[PDB]
Amino acid sequence: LGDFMDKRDASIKEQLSGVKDTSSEVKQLEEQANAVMRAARAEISAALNKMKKETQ
Amino acid sequence: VGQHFYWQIGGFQIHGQVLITSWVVIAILLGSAAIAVRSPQTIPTGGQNFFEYVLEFIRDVSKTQIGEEYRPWVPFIGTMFLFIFVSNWSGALLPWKIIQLPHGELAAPTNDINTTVALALLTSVAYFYAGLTKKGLGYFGKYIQPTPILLPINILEDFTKPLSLSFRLFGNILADELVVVVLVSLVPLVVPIPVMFLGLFTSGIQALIFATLAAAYIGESLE
């Protein structure tokens, strides 16, 4: 008579744990979506300047 | 009116009301509990809803009182709740004046000495054991640090509390038996109509107060 309500509350428990790890993953994936173009744009200007020194 | 015993000797003079009433009430209680827990669904269906409502009632009244480890005493206090509940309803309802007994009567388990003093004794054994468990084995709750006088009265109250709860159950169920027997002995039963409601209310709340009073005292055992 106990495990029947244990399951019905454990559903909300696993749900809230899932939403917590979900929000962590959302911020991390948006960080990486910013980061890939940011890394490309920054390093391309880096190589631009460095090769431009030898060009001058 | 005949409450003593009948001579069903078994090594010592044993009470007959005690035996038959407590045996049949335990039997019908386990027959109710066992046949309906065979095939339970995850949804609280017809009887499982009632049984789980009783059990969450016991969960609340055991969670609010005792301490951090009430769950192993939830079986004890819950079977006590169920026993007093069904025995009060059986004393209010189940017919035992049309059936006659040659040597005595047969009304309820708590009408006699044995199955109230047995409850008191089992609770007291549980209190002494739980006090020697949760506290040390040298001196249980008896030991007096602040006051130099409370040393004998500590064991004296630890002796006089279970008998007090016993006398509570006595003064409830014996009074109820007197109500019902004189009220059906008045005249045909056109008189018990309003009194049956008060008896039912008092019996149900008698079960509840016995439950919470067992809870309070295993709480003191924890303390």
Curated annotation (Swiss-Prot), chain A:
<comment type="similarity">
    <text>Belongs to the ATPase B chain family.</text>
</comment>
<comment type="function">
    <text>F(1)F(0) ATP synthase produces ATP from ADP in the presence of a proton or sodium gradient. F-type ATPases consist of two structural domains, F(1) containing the extramembraneous catalytic core and F(0) containing the membrane proton channel, linked together by a central stalk and a peripheral stalk. During catalysis, ATP synthesis in the catalytic domain of F(1) is coupled via a rotary mechanism of the central stalk subunits to proton translocation.</text>
</comment>
<protein>
    <recommendedName>
        <fullName>ATP synthase subunit b', chloroplastic</fullName>
    </recommendedName>
</protein>
<comment type="subunit">
    <text>F-type ATPases have 2 components, F(1) - the catalytic core - and F(0) - the membrane proton channel. F(1) has five subunits: alpha(3), beta(3), gamma(1), delta(1), epsilon(1). F(0) has four main subunits: a(1), b(1), b'(1) and c(10-14). The alpha and beta chains form an alternating ring which encloses part of the gamma chain. F(1) is attached to F(0) by a central stalk formed by the gamma and epsilon chains, while a peripheral stalk is formed by the delta, b and b' chains.</text>
</comment>
<comment type="function">
    <text>Component of the F(0) channel, it forms part of the peripheral stalk, linking F(1) to F(0). The b'-subunit is a diverged and duplicated form of b found in plants and photosynthetic bacteria.</text>
</comment>
Curated annotation (Swiss-Prot), chain B:
<keyword id="KW-0406">Ion transport</keyword>
<dbReference type="InterPro" id="IPR045082">
    <property type="entry name" value="ATP_syn_F0_a_bact/chloroplast"/>
</dbReference>
<keyword id="KW-0066">ATP synthesis</keyword>
<dbReference type="GO" id="GO:0045259">
    <property type="term" value="C:proton-transporting ATP synthase complex"/>
</dbReference>
<keyword id="KW-0812">Transmembrane</keyword>
<feature type="transmembrane region" description="Helical">
    <location>
        <begin position="74"/>
        <end position="94"/>
    </location>
</feature>
<keyword id="KW-0150">Chloroplast</keyword>
<dbReference type="InterPro" id="IPR023011">
    <property type="entry name" value="ATP_synth_F0_asu_AS"/>
</dbReference>
<feature type="transmembrane region" description="Helical">
    <location>
        <begin position="199"/>
        <end position="219"/>
    </location>
</feature>
<comment type="subunit">
    <text>F-type ATPases have 2 components, CF(1) - the catalytic core - and CF(0) - the membrane proton channel. CF(1) has five subunits: alpha(3), beta(3), gamma(1), delta(1), epsilon(1). CF(0) has four main subunits: a, b, b' and c.</text>
</comment>
<dbReference type="InterPro" id="IPR035908">
    <property type="entry name" value="F0_ATP_A_sf"/>
</dbReference>
<keyword id="KW-0375">Hydrogen ion transport</keyword>
<dbReference type="Pfam" id="PF00119">
    <property type="entry name" value="ATP-synt_A"/>
</dbReference>
<keyword id="KW-0934">Plastid</keyword>
<dbReference type="GO" id="GO:0005886">
    <property type="term" value="C:plasma membrane"/>
</dbReference>
<feature type="transmembrane region" description="Helical">
    <location>
        <begin position="178"/>
        <end position="198"/>
    </location>
</feature>
<dbReference type="GO" id="GO:0009535">
    <property type="term" value="C:chloroplast thylakoid membrane"/>
</dbReference>
<dbReference type="InterPro" id="IPR000568">
    <property type="entry name" value="ATP_synth_F0_asu"/>
</dbReference>
<keyword id="KW-0138">CF(0)</keyword>
<keyword id="KW-0793">Thylakoid</keyword>
<protein>
    <recommendedName>
        <fullName>ATP synthase subunit a, chloroplastic</fullName>
    </recommendedName>
</protein>
<comment type="function">
    <text>Key component of the proton channel; it plays a direct role in the translocation of protons across the membrane.</text>
</comment>
